Amino acid sequence: SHMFVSEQSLNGRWTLKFFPQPAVPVMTIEGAEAANGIVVDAVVPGNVEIDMEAAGLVEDPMVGNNIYKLRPYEGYQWYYSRTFAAPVVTEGQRLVLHFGGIDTFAEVYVNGIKVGSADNMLIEHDYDITSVVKEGENRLDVIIRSSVMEAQNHFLGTLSIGNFSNEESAPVRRAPSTYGWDIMPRLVSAGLWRDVTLRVENPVTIVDANWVTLSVNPKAREASESLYLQTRLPFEMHDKVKAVITISRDGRQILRKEALMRKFANLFTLNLSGVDAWWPRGYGEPALYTAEVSLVDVTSGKIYDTKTSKIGFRTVKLELDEVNLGQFQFIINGEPVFAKGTNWVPLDALHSRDASHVEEAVQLMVEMNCNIVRCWGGNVYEDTHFFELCDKYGIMVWQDFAMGCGNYSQRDNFAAALEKEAISVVVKLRNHPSLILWSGNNPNNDRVSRQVLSRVIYEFDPTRPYLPSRGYYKDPFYTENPSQFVSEIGYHGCPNRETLERMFSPDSVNPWQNGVVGMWNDEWQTKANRIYDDKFQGGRNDLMTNQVRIIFGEVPADLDDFIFASQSVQAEAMKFFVELWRGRRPYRTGIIWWNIRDGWPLLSDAISDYWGGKKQAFYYMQNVHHDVCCLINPAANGYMLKVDNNTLKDFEGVVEVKDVASGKQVFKGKFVSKANQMSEIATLPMQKGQGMLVISYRIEGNEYFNHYLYGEPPYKLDQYRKWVKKCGIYE
Amino acid sequence: SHMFVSEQSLNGRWTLKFFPQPAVPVMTIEGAEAANGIVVDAVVPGNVEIDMEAAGLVEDPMVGNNIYKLRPYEGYQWYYSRTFAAPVVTEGQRLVLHFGGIDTFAEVYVNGIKVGSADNMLIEHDYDITSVVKEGENRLDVIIRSSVMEAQNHFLGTLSIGNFSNEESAPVRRAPSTYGWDIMPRLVSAGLWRDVTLRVENPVTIVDANWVTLSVNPKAREASESLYLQTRLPFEMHDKVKAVITISRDGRQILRKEALMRKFANLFTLNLSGVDAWWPRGYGEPALYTAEVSLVDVTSGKIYDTKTSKIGFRTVKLELDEGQPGQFQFIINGEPVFAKGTNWVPLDALHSRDASHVEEAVQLMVEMNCNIVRCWGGNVYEDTHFFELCDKYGIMVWQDFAMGCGNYSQRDNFAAALEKEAISVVVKLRNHPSLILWSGNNPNNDRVSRQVLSRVIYEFDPTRPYLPSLWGPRGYYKDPFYTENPSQFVSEIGYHGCPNRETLERMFSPDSVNPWQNGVVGMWNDEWQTKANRIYDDKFQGGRNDLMTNQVRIIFGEVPADLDDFIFASQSVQAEAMKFFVELWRGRRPYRTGIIWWNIRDGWPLLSDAISDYWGGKKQAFYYMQNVHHDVCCLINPAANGYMLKVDNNTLKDFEGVVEVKDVASGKQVFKGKFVSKANQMSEIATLPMQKGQGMLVISYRIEGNEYFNHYLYGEPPYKLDQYRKWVKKCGIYEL
């Protein structure tokens, strides 16, 4: 929270006028008003496709092949307009027009006077409009031009052409996935997709409050926290304003410090007592403390400004193995942590709806017990509320800078745009305890990943590490990979029937074209995802049929049997991958799987879909993501029962292995799970043929369950179903 | 070929007004018309000295000391003027005024409106004049200022002062040799030295077609070619235009692929069958294929643009054998190739005449059988036609960026000027199969040669190697300086040679044709000193010309007083030295990997170490060098108790033959026998016994019905000139 003096929202009903962009792009209000176009009511924050669909001008892009009908609007312009009232501004105060998100290339006018030129979808834009504001109605006009056509203002290098990321994405600062990807639709879109506000700032104001943990002693309940404070301070206010710093928790004041402001920028170091450390999930408590800084007149007591945030006392270090060679391990508060989590993709192709999805999506990670999440560079940067939830629930955040599968310009103009973006995002997010790493998502000669971004982290966040950058799930590709830390590992899975009936037209809900199993109809090809409407057979969807065929021999023709088979192979594979890394500790250090939630109704390798449809893989993963988990990994002539502890406490329990069909107890006995390590229990003999062992362990009175599928594929689908039904764990 | 919609030539007669440059340079049409100057007719493309000589205002700079009489014009300004009729431009179409070459600092005006400010003589300049053009007669005015005076707009660093390259060249982007070199006259010059055209472009047009060879399988006659296509495409034309890619050879089509244009830039990977790889001379055929890409309307079938080039399927890897100087070898199509060729210097001091020399000059390399050529960084970048000829004849091209014998600013403004130049020239030439290397020609902290240029190659030509970078005493060619130099790959090596008599009689005044001032041998007259070359008219004796006499005195004991005897002596020393250098590197393979010698042709009538002069007069070294540049060449190297008869093979084929070595003076047979020359290697034939005294051995070899000849001068200097002349005459290989 940041008080200022007043913050008046400009969200609500705007007027949107759209029209095809001429050869000479419209940049003035006069050109926008003279252009022949269509005028509709609009909602801010919003996307232009939501406004046109509300007007009945476009069909629902989430159904069938309606995504391709939005293609002509990629060459359109969008003219937002509204009138507003200007608040009273006293002497020395500044009126600031704040845009949370402009998508993308736009000219901003207040009362016919241009106040800004925006060209970065991913960062905020603030314009001082104190001098252009007038009494009564103030005209606010935003004229956006075509992002796609902007790409032709640039000459591309050889290494920027032919990558998975679109060439139109290379020279502009937008989320690469908006142009299309394997897991996102091509929906370039436009509009004011985040809040628009009017801010009044006092002459004495807080420019930035940077909280940094210098040290932490979790056992003594102590921590050293530094505050790098920058302010605007008139010289008459020097020695007449004091900074008041208050740390609290549950309304209880932990520390108060006052200091006379003798210069605009200061470093205050606070040696705190009776404070708990911020820990990721399983490894401890996500302790957060309210840190408030206020600038107060020493004579009148008037508060000129106040910034408040919840901070966590924690230290983060990445250890990079450079002799025995993803060969790294995160060290939090001086303890080696095993990372288990998901990759974070766009929450919505229409990104103005991202904020409405954040709460439910973080809840998915909490129920999965993820302790880490990697925000993928194909997506936009998430807003403050996402990181505040990750602070609260103890989920570490790996933040990629917004660049996708490809390479970018080595020249000055791009380097300046990316430096402006990187400084903004770093300053915005560097105070969240959840954030643990910056990445360039990218070769060692790349100026982008090895100079520009590293220079920003060096100057504006030297407390966090920066890093410059298909078949059966038991093949050596997955079982003999030497990477201690895997960051992308995924397996396809057909969505639930209910999701299929909502996104596919009734004639196309069944996947098979003219009944032939394996021949996908066009609507299923569009939902693979196909960026452009090029009719073809095969491609990405075939991954589902191939995987099901390797495991069960044959692809079912009944849609419900196909859904069960596809979600069951995705469930077994992902579960096997997690157990393989959790079981091969301490060598394995982390696994970040792909992915937890889709950002659009599509056929994908996610374990949950856009509408909340949890696939079978979600529940399987849930049982192999506990703090302490008993699991079975393959072994030389047998199977190995192991327990993995991802906490700092020792635990005791008992485990009962048994075959589903026979009921023969293969093993029963107590175990001791030492803190923060893999502990083997017993080597179990080989079982005959196919089947399913069931694991039942009890710790501190609670009952947990797991299983292990033995044998070698192909399995009969009808038999595998009976094994799970008798296992009694899943449905 | 790039079709566009139309290309009207603005070449032809212009009006040229010139005047001394005032303290404040004239940069407006008003100031140019108000200045007191001289108006003459001019020819574009051209240089201002050609126009002034056509008007009888200057004397021929190629004769005597007339080069120094052009000195005052370095401080002049040059005002070009002509009228042109505007072509018809439909809506959305674009009218582009294209300059192939402006030398150099000029303000361009169309109909009184400034459209550009040029400041680089080595690269093209394009200006969109669609909105400034008018109906009827239009006006084109170009106002050039003094390049020399432009240097004083810059403060030079210590390392940019005192080099062989002129301080006036350091801050400006112009060919360094224009300011004078030891092999080029000082002729700064100016003018529109390349074509000036008007191009009409459709709203849909090809911006660039970059052809890259990913792989080649010569025996399977296959190749994987990538087309990196960038276009200008209105969004209304998206999904309504298709790219048509056609690879052909002699009218026979090899590939025809059509693809709907859904984005402005695309990578098209083309896996071809029935295609032959491109090879350098000796190693195979220089197979070329016409690659044409066209943007076609999917409905009307209208062709909006067409780009056509001749490409070749080849791979190039520079194998750094390791970093001593010249410790590398070029690998073409997976095979280690032995490079042999010449450095490429200016074709003319008045560079607008370069294009008229290109065909004859390249033919010299074909007659010599060079498989490589290093375009020296003191010259301008050659135009497309030079690289087309090197593609056609299989001559690999090593391209220096345009800096010489110099150190340069580490500051931003020079870096930005060089980056714009490098991007332009790389994009222009990156599709020629002949081109195989980019060089900075430059210590390891130099921003220019270790950051600016390497960054341009990193982004715009990752397919070709980039390198950031033997004269010395110039004594006896068998000195340990040459014979024990460890460089596997030598890029510069040369020896002086007096030009033929006809050239001397055309370049000097009648009283100055004989070199000896007042008749004393070894003392050069003033005109010969000018042709050294001498950059500034400082009178002195000795200097560079003493290389000719010192090298003759080492080999033949005394300098002949007679001119015809002196020409034969000097050219014989150059011929024996250069031949020895090539035989020494070919004979010591596989350690030696290449020899690029200096040089094949003069860019100006001068006294030099070139083997043929500016007017085409071939010195004796040209013929000696021809006989040691064959694909398969029998040669003799010194051994310590005799000589070693060797045969070198610069092909991928085995050959058999017979060789005979005889003493010329006595006629006795030293060796005769058959030999097998294994492919792409040096093979030792026989150790030959030590001969007595001085003389010449004649090497006669026959390969597949064809008879070839070489020789070896044995003994140690000093030799007697008359005896050497009789040995060459009796040998029968070369005419005296």
Side-chain angles (χ1 to χ4, degrees), chain A residues 475-500:
Chain A
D475 279 2
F477 175 46
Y478 307 95
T479 68
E480 302 180 4
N481 165 249
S483 305
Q484 304 178 299
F485 199 104
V486 41
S487 58
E488 288 196 6
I489 184 159
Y491 226 53
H492 255 87
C494 181
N496 290 329
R497 157 180 282 272
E498 313 95 286
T499 292
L500 304 174

Short mmCIF file of all heavy atoms in Angstrom, two decimals, chain A residues 475-500:
data_model
loop_
_atom_site.label_atom_id
_atom_site.label_comp_id
_atom_site.label_asym_id
_atom_site.label_seq_id
_atom_site.Cartn_x
_atom_site.Cartn_y
_atom_site.Cartn_z
N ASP A 475 12.08 -44.44 -20.50
CA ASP A 475 13.22 -44.52 -21.40
C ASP A 475 14.42 -43.80 -20.78
O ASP A 475 14.25 -42.93 -19.92
CB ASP A 475 12.86 -43.91 -22.76
CG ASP A 475 12.08 -44.87 -23.64
OD1 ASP A 475 11.78 -46.00 -23.19
OD2 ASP A 475 11.76 -44.50 -24.79
N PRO A 476 15.64 -44.15 -21.20
CA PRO A 476 16.83 -43.52 -20.58
C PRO A 476 16.88 -42.01 -20.74
O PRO A 476 17.63 -41.36 -20.00
CB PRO A 476 18.00 -44.20 -21.30
CG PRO A 476 17.41 -44.73 -22.58
CD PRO A 476 16.02 -45.13 -22.23
N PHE A 477 16.12 -41.44 -21.68
CA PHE A 477 16.08 -39.99 -21.83
C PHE A 477 15.65 -39.32 -20.53
O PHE A 477 16.18 -38.25 -20.17
CB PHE A 477 15.14 -39.62 -22.98
CG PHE A 477 14.93 -38.15 -23.15
CD1 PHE A 477 16.00 -37.26 -23.13
CD2 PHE A 477 13.65 -37.64 -23.36
CE1 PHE A 477 15.79 -35.91 -23.30
CE2 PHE A 477 13.45 -36.29 -23.53
CZ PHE A 477 14.52 -35.42 -23.50
N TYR A 478 14.72 -39.93 -19.80
CA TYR A 478 14.26 -39.39 -18.53
C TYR A 478 14.91 -40.04 -17.32
O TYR A 478 15.04 -39.38 -16.28
CB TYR A 478 12.74 -39.55 -18.41
CG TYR A 478 11.95 -39.00 -19.58
CD1 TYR A 478 11.57 -39.82 -20.63
CD2 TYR A 478 11.59 -37.66 -19.63
CE1 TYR A 478 10.85 -39.32 -21.71
CE2 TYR A 478 10.87 -37.15 -20.70
CZ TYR A 478 10.51 -37.99 -21.74
OH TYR A 478 9.79 -37.49 -22.80
N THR A 479 15.34 -41.30 -17.43
CA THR A 479 15.85 -42.03 -16.27
C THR A 479 17.35 -41.89 -16.08
O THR A 479 17.85 -42.17 -14.99
CB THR A 479 15.49 -43.51 -16.38
OG1 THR A 479 16.21 -44.10 -17.47
CG2 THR A 479 14.00 -43.69 -16.61
N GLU A 480 18.08 -41.48 -17.12
CA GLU A 480 19.53 -41.34 -17.03
C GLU A 480 20.00 -39.92 -17.28
O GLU A 480 21.21 -39.69 -17.43
CB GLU A 480 20.22 -42.30 -18.00
CG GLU A 480 19.86 -43.76 -17.77
CD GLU A 480 20.55 -44.70 -18.74
OE1 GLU A 480 21.37 -44.21 -19.55
OE2 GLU A 480 20.28 -45.92 -18.70
N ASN A 481 19.09 -38.96 -17.33
CA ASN A 481 19.47 -37.56 -17.48
C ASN A 481 20.24 -37.11 -16.25
O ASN A 481 19.76 -37.28 -15.12
CB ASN A 481 18.23 -36.70 -17.70
CG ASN A 481 18.51 -35.22 -17.51
OD1 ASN A 481 18.04 -34.61 -16.55
ND2 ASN A 481 19.28 -34.64 -18.42
N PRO A 482 21.44 -36.54 -16.40
CA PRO A 482 22.26 -36.18 -15.25
C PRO A 482 21.95 -34.83 -14.62
O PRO A 482 22.69 -34.41 -13.73
CB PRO A 482 23.68 -36.18 -15.85
CG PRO A 482 23.46 -35.71 -17.25
CD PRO A 482 22.13 -36.28 -17.68
N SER A 483 20.89 -34.15 -15.04
CA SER A 483 20.60 -32.82 -14.52
C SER A 483 20.06 -32.91 -13.10
O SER A 483 19.00 -33.51 -12.87
CB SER A 483 19.60 -32.10 -15.43
OG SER A 483 20.07 -32.07 -16.77
N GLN A 484 20.78 -32.31 -12.15
CA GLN A 484 20.32 -32.31 -10.77
C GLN A 484 19.00 -31.57 -10.62
O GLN A 484 18.18 -31.92 -9.76
CB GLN A 484 21.38 -31.68 -9.86
CG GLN A 484 22.75 -32.35 -9.94
CD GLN A 484 23.78 -31.66 -9.07
OE1 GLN A 484 24.09 -30.48 -9.25
NE2 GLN A 484 24.32 -32.41 -8.11
N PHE A 485 18.77 -30.55 -11.44
CA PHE A 485 17.59 -29.70 -11.35
C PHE A 485 16.92 -29.68 -12.71
O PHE A 485 17.49 -29.17 -13.68
CB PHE A 485 17.98 -28.28 -10.92
CG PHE A 485 16.84 -27.47 -10.36
CD1 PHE A 485 16.73 -27.26 -8.99
CD2 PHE A 485 15.90 -26.90 -11.19
CE1 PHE A 485 15.69 -26.51 -8.47
CE2 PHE A 485 14.86 -26.15 -10.68
CZ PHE A 485 14.76 -25.95 -9.32
N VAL A 486 15.70 -30.21 -12.79
CA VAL A 486 14.90 -30.18 -14.01
C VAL A 486 13.87 -29.08 -13.87
O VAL A 486 13.19 -28.98 -12.84
CB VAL A 486 14.24 -31.55 -14.28
CG1 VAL A 486 13.71 -32.15 -12.99
CG2 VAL A 486 13.12 -31.40 -15.30
N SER A 487 13.76 -28.23 -14.90
CA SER A 487 12.87 -27.08 -14.87
C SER A 487 11.68 -27.20 -15.81
O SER A 487 10.73 -26.42 -15.68
CB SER A 487 13.64 -25.80 -15.20
OG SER A 487 14.26 -25.87 -16.47
N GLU A 488 11.71 -28.13 -16.77
CA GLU A 488 10.59 -28.34 -17.68
C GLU A 488 10.48 -29.84 -17.95
O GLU A 488 11.37 -30.43 -18.56
CB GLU A 488 10.77 -27.58 -18.99
CG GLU A 488 10.59 -26.07 -18.87
CD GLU A 488 10.38 -25.40 -20.21
OE1 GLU A 488 10.27 -26.12 -21.22
OE2 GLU A 488 10.33 -24.15 -20.25
N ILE A 489 9.38 -30.44 -17.49
CA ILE A 489 9.13 -31.85 -17.71
C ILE A 489 7.62 -32.06 -17.76
O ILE A 489 6.90 -31.74 -16.81
CB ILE A 489 9.81 -32.72 -16.64
CG1 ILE A 489 9.63 -34.21 -16.92
CG2 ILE A 489 9.36 -32.35 -15.22
CD1 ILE A 489 10.65 -35.08 -16.23
N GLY A 490 7.12 -32.56 -18.89
CA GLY A 490 5.68 -32.60 -19.11
C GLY A 490 5.25 -33.79 -19.94
O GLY A 490 6.05 -34.39 -20.66
N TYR A 491 3.97 -34.11 -19.82
CA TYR A 491 3.36 -35.23 -20.53
C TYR A 491 1.92 -34.86 -20.86
O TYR A 491 1.21 -34.32 -20.01
CB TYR A 491 3.41 -36.50 -19.69
CG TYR A 491 3.87 -37.72 -20.44
CD1 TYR A 491 5.06 -37.71 -21.16
CD2 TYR A 491 3.12 -38.89 -20.43
CE1 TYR A 491 5.49 -38.83 -21.85
CE2 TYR A 491 3.55 -40.01 -21.11
CZ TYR A 491 4.73 -39.98 -21.82
OH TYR A 491 5.13 -41.11 -22.49
N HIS A 492 1.51 -35.14 -22.09
CA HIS A 492 0.18 -34.75 -22.56
C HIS A 492 -0.92 -35.45 -21.77
O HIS A 492 -0.73 -36.53 -21.21
CB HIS A 492 0.03 -35.07 -24.05
CG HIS A 492 0.11 -33.86 -24.94
ND1 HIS A 492 1.31 -33.38 -25.42
CD2 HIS A 492 -0.85 -33.05 -25.43
CE1 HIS A 492 1.08 -32.31 -26.17
NE2 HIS A 492 -0.23 -32.09 -26.19
N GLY A 493 -2.08 -34.81 -21.73
CA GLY A 493 -3.24 -35.36 -21.06
C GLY A 493 -4.55 -34.78 -21.56
O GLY A 493 -4.75 -33.56 -21.50
N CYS A 494 -5.43 -35.63 -22.06
CA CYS A 494 -6.69 -35.15 -22.62
C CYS A 494 -7.56 -34.55 -21.52
O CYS A 494 -7.67 -35.11 -20.43
CB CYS A 494 -7.43 -36.30 -23.31
SG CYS A 494 -8.99 -35.84 -24.08
N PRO A 495 -8.19 -33.40 -21.77
CA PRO A 495 -9.01 -32.76 -20.74
C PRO A 495 -10.25 -33.58 -20.42
O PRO A 495 -10.59 -34.55 -21.09
CB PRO A 495 -9.38 -31.41 -21.37
CG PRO A 495 -8.38 -31.19 -22.45
CD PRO A 495 -8.05 -32.55 -22.97
N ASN A 496 -10.92 -33.16 -19.35
CA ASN A 496 -12.16 -33.81 -18.93
C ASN A 496 -13.24 -33.65 -20.00
O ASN A 496 -13.23 -32.69 -20.78
CB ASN A 496 -12.65 -33.24 -17.60
CG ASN A 496 -11.76 -33.63 -16.43
OD1 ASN A 496 -11.16 -34.70 -16.42
ND2 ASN A 496 -11.68 -32.76 -15.43
N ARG A 497 -14.18 -34.60 -20.02
CA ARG A 497 -15.26 -34.55 -21.00
C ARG A 497 -16.06 -33.26 -20.90
O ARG A 497 -16.43 -32.67 -21.93
CB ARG A 497 -16.19 -35.75 -20.83
CG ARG A 497 -17.59 -35.52 -21.39
CD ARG A 497 -18.50 -36.72 -21.21
NE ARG A 497 -18.24 -37.76 -22.19
CZ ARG A 497 -18.81 -37.83 -23.39
NH1 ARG A 497 -19.68 -36.92 -23.79
NH2 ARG A 497 -18.51 -38.84 -24.20
N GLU A 498 -16.32 -32.80 -19.68
CA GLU A 498 -17.09 -31.57 -19.49
C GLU A 498 -16.39 -30.38 -20.15
O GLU A 498 -17.05 -29.53 -20.76
CB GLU A 498 -17.30 -31.31 -18.00
CG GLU A 498 -17.77 -32.53 -17.20
CD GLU A 498 -16.62 -33.29 -16.55
OE1 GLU A 498 -15.88 -34.00 -17.26
OE2 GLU A 498 -16.47 -33.18 -15.31
N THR A 499 -15.07 -30.31 -20.03
CA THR A 499 -14.32 -29.26 -20.71
C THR A 499 -14.41 -29.41 -22.22
O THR A 499 -14.55 -28.42 -22.95
CB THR A 499 -12.86 -29.27 -20.25
OG1 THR A 499 -12.80 -28.87 -18.87
CG2 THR A 499 -12.02 -28.32 -21.09
N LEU A 500 -14.34 -30.65 -22.72
CA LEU A 500 -14.43 -30.88 -24.15
C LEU A 500 -15.76 -30.41 -24.72
O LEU A 500 -15.81 -29.79 -25.79
CB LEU A 500 -14.22 -32.37 -24.45
CG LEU A 500 -12.93 -33.01 -23.95
CD1 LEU A 500 -12.95 -34.51 -24.19
CD2 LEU A 500 -11.71 -32.39 -24.60
#
